[PDB]
Amino acid sequence: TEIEHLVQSVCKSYRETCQLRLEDLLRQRSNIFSREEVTGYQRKSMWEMWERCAHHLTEAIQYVVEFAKRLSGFMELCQNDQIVLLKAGAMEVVLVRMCRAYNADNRTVFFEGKYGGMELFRALGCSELISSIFDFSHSLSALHFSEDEIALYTALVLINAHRPGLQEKRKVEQLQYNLELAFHHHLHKTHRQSILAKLPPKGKLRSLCSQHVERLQIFQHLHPIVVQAAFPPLYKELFS
Ligand SMILES: CC(C)CCC[C@@H](C)[C@H]1CC[C@H]2[C@@H]3CC=C4C[C@@H](O)CC[C@]4(C)[C@H]3CC[C@]12C
Ligand SMILES: Cc1cc2c(s1)c(-c1ccc(C(=O)O)cc1)nn2C(=O)c1c(Cl)cccc1Cl
C-alpha cells in the first residue's frame, strides 16, 4: 500500500513536470521542418543556436529539479545530498526524457514546435556529440517506454546512493530501495519486466552526459547565457 502510494506520487510529480505532453508529441510527428526551415536554422550563428539550445536545456533541467523536489522524501534529505544527487543526475534525466520527443521512424526530435533531424544543429559544430545524443534516444526508443516507466526509471537515475560525496548515505539508500521496489512492482503488474534487461548500461548514460555537460560548459565559457536561476545551491555548482 505504501508502495502503490509511492508509484502514484512519483507518476504525479512526473505528470506535473514532464514539460511536454506525450499526446502532443505523438500528434505532432507529421509536423516536420521543411528544407527551407532547416536551412534557416543552419544559417543561424553558432552563438544564436547556442543561446536558444542553452535556454531550452536550462528549462529542461529546472523541470527535472521540480520533479526531484516532489519525490517523497527528497526534501527531507540534507541540502548537501539534494545537490549531490541533482548535480550527478539532473542532466542524465533530461537525456532520458528526450526519447519521448524523438521519432525513430525518421530520426527526428521535437524542437521549437516541429520535428527536425540532427542536421538542424549544424551551426553548433558538435556533430559527433549530437549524433551520440540522437543514437542514445534511438536505443531508448526501442523500449517504447510508458509514462509510468519513464517516471519510475528517472526517479532511480536521480536517487542513487552510490553517488560520491553523500553525507547521509543510509537515508538515500532507504528512498532508493523503496523506488526500486515501486518500479519492480509496477513492471510485474504490467507484464513489462522484460525492459529490465534492456535499460541503458549505467556507464553509457554517465559518459554521454559527462561529454554533454562538458560541451555546454565550453559554450558557456566562450558565450555566457543569462540563466533564470531558480535553485541557487545547484546553480552555484554548475556556473562560475
Ligand atoms: C551540445 C549542445 C550545445 C547541443 C544539443 C543539441 C540538441 C541535442 C538539444 C538542444 C535542445 C534540446 C532539447 C531541449 C528540451 C527538451 C525537453 C525535454 O523534455 C526532453 C529533452 C529535450 C527535447 C532536449 C533534447 C536535446 C536538444 C534537442
Ligand atoms: C547536472 C546539471 C547540469 C546543468 C545544470 S544541473 C544546470 C542548471 C540550470 C539552472 C539551474 C537553476 O538554478 O535554475 C541550476 C542548474 N545547467 N546545466 C548545464 O549543463 C548547462 C545548461 Cl543546461 C545551460 C548552459 C550551461 C550549462 Cl553548464
Side-chain angles (χ1 to χ4, degrees), residues 25-34 36-201 203 205-214:
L25 294 167
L26 299 178
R27 189 198 331 283
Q28 296 256 52
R29 290 189 161 199
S30 50
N31 192 13
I32 292 158
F33 287 116
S34 70
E36 254 183 51
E37 295 173 312
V38 168
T39 300
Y41 273 111
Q42 293 180 328
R43 294 187 62 212
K44 289 180 179 301
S45 175
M46 169 179 282
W47 310 104
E48 167 180 357
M49 278 301 280
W50 154 248
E51 285 166 4
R52 288 187 183 232
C53 290
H55 282 114
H56 296 317
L57 283 163
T58 298
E59 186 181 3
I61 285 286
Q62 288 167 339
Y63 280 92
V64 168
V65 175
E66 290 289 352
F67 172 70
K69 285 186 55 194
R70 284 164 202 235
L71 294 179
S72 183
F74 186 83
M75 291 311 276
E76 287 60 64
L77 302 180
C78 74
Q79 190 166 263
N80 168 89
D81 286 2
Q82 295 172 7
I83 298 322
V84 164
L85 291 178
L86 290 170
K87 189 192 181 178
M91 189 64 74
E92 290 177 349
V93 170
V94 172
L95 293 170
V96 167
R97 285 175 163 215
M98 177 174 164
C99 71
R100 295 170 78 237
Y102 177 83
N103 181 1
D105 293 327
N106 64 4
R107 317 178 89 105
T108 60
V109 69
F110 188 72
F111 180 74
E112 294 195 345
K114 303 186 181 190
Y115 284 88
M118 56 183 286
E119 75 272 9
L120 215 61
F121 304 96
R122 194 185 76 193
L124 289 176
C126 285
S127 67
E128 167 130 45
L129 171 59
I130 292 178
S131 194
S132 296
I133 294 170
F134 275 60
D135 288 346
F136 182 73
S137 270
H138 199 81
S139 296
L140 275 194
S141 80
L143 275 53
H144 297 96
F145 269 143
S146 74
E147 292 291 278
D148 296 341
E149 289 165 0
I150 281 179
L152 287 162
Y153 176 64
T154 56
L156 284 168
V157 169
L158 288 167
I159 308 306
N160 175 356
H162 297 325
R163 301 316 196 167
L166 293 176
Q167 292 175 6
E168 305 177 333
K169 191 176 172 195
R170 290 200 303 291
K171 273 193 201 183
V172 179
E173 286 172 342
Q174 181 62 87
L175 295 201
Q176 182 180 343
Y177 299 149
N178 287 344
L179 288 162
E180 291 171 338
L181 176 47
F183 183 45
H184 300 152
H185 177 81
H186 194 78
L187 299 175
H188 172 78
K189 234 197 319 185
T190 59
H191 310 291
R192 285 288 286 180
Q193 291 167 299
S194 65
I195 72 163
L196 286 171
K198 296 186 176 149
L199 290 172
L205 183 48
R206 181 186 328 124
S207 53
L208 173 69
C209 179
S210 138
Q211 293 168 30
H212 184 223
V213 172
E214 164 181 55

